[PDB]
Design a protein around this ligand. Structure first.
Ligand code: HEM
Ligand code: NA
Ligand SMILES: [Xe]
Length: 183
């Protein structure tokens, strides 16, 4: 994934647990050979998977719980590290935001030529609910989508309730989430 993602992980861990913990996790992840992540440079997806697993071991939290926290953090992080206007342009409510997500990644994709973004599709079931279809080239990030939806929730001052109804992990085609929302 692009370094921006790994910088964000480093930043979340450092701010919440301190630099000493961040150095232990980096060492454990097998990355001592990397002084710093380059935001606009492509890295092997392995770098990120090794960091999550090393953080899970060192911090004693399941990888899935860290991915939910990272998903909320990403909403705030991008807005403060050069992408606030891009975010604002994708809208001012949770559902309109999700409709634009493919289009937001296409814009991100101008500047990150080698991006493999997720694909998201909405089916609106009412003015207060939707089904969200998530398809990805990667495994295991559905829990990250749960935290991102909560970050967008805090962003738009909107109560959100998210329940996953289908799992790529239990053989289903792709992950589907059921979302209820409300001002
Ligand atoms: C301006 C804001 C954002 C920027 C600059 C950005 C950029 C990125 C980048 C660089 C990646 C890594 C992909 C790669 O290296 O191939 C990524 C992945 C991802 N992004 Fe976005 N992103 C933004 C906002 C969001 C938001 C708000 C969501 C909320 C759903 C989201 C959903 C995801 C997911 C689930 C992935 C995991 C990759 C996958 O599933 O295959 N992004 N994004
Ligand atoms: Na990576
Ligand atoms: Xe992300």
């Amino acid at each position: 994934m692009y370094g921006l993602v790994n910088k964000a992980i480093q930043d979340m861990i450092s701010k919440h647990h301190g630099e000493d913990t961040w150095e232990a996790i980096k060492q454990k992840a097998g990355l001592e050979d990397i002084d710093f992540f380059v935001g606009m440079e492509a890295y092997s997806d392995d770098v990120t998977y090794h960091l999550v697993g090393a953080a899970s071991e060192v911090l004693g939290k399941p990888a899935e719980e860290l991915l939910i926290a990272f998903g909320e953090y990403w909403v705030t992080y991008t807005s403060e590290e050069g992408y606030g206007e891009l975010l604002a342009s994708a809208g001012d409510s949770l559902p309109e935001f999700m409709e634009n997500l493919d289009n937001l990644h296409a814009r991100v994709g101008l500047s990150f030529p080698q991006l493999r973004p997720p694909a998201f599709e909405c089916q609106h079931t009412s003015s207060k609910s939707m089904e969200l279809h998530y398809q990805s080239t990667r495994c295991g990030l559905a829990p990250m989508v749960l935290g991102l939806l909560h970050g967008l929730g805090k962003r738009f001052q909107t109560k959100v309730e998210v329940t996953q109804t289908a799992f790529r992990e239990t053989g289903e085609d792709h992950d589907i989430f059921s979302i209820k929302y409300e001002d």
